[PDB]
Design a protein around this ligand. Structure first.
Ligand SMILES: CCCCC/C=C/C/C=C/CCCCCCCC(=O)O
Lengths: 49, 98, 49, 49
């Protein structure tokens, strides 16, 4: 996104009807923080959400 | 005379007394064998836990083993207690027959 | 016993992917530790080397 | 098993395994006590016969 909401008034986007292929992020995104709470991250590709 | 020879030849009649002995021996041997169970712990051996882990981590592993060991002992006592009720009933009958 | 030292260079935001159970381009395609890994992981910021 | 990886799943599974044995041990103990009672009845029945 060009712009993000401030923490004061955070945005909430609904996601539906799509494939969660997060490997598309590997070519250029970099995340210093990442943690899953309700699922082990290695299982993200075998599940529907 | 026939009884004497019968007892000398075949010991199977005495299986009832042999069974009491064997059952108690097995219960005690079972308690030793169950010591090897991990019960959710990394290792069944307290020395492995204590050597590799510091106190606060070791405490978790030890507590799992302690609970498990009591479970084995409680099982043992309950089985001995039920068997004791059965042996008492036999003893009461034996006393009556005497 | 059976002591081995694996050795490599990664991006700082990827250090977190070394730990067992993680996902990401390093954890999935370059270097992965087993679920029951029994060793130690050590790392440092070589930004001048 | 679907949501957790092996080392996390193992904790959850071990809790269920212990609990399931607790249910079975309870069952066996109750059957065993009842067996003592049915035997006493059977002995009396044999005597009356
Ligand atoms: C907006 C996507 C759809 C939402 C549904 C849930 C999807 C689960 C996926 C989450 C993203 C995981 C990305 C992990 C970081 C990889 C970075 C790297 O290795 O460099």
């Amino acid at each position: 996104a060009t712009r993000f909401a401030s923490v004061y008034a955070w945005n909430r986007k609904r996601i539906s009807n799509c494939v969660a292929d997060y490997s598309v992020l590997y070519n250029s995104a970099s995340f210093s923080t990442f943690k899953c709470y309700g699922v082990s991250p290695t299982k993200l590709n075998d599940l529907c959400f | 005379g026939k009884i004497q020879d019968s007892l000398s030849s075949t010991a199977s009649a005495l299986g009832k007394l042999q069974d009491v002995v064997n059952q108690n021996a097995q219960a005690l041997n079972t308690l030793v064998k169950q010591l090897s169970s991990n019960f959710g712990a990394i290792s069944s051996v307290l020395n492995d836990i204590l050597s590799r882990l510091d106190p606060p981590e070791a405490e978790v592993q030890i507590d799992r083993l302690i609970t498990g060991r009591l479970q084995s002992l409680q099982t043992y006592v309950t089985q001995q207690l039920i068997r004791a009720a059965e042996i008492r009933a036999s003893a009461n009958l034996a006393a009556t027959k005497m | 016993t059976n002591v081995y030292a694996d050795s490599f260079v990664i991006r700082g935001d990827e250090v977190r992917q070394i730990a067992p159970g993680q996902t990401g381009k390093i954890a999935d395609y370059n270097y992965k530790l087993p679920d029951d890994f029994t060793g130690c992981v050590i790392a440092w910021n070589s930004n001048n080397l």
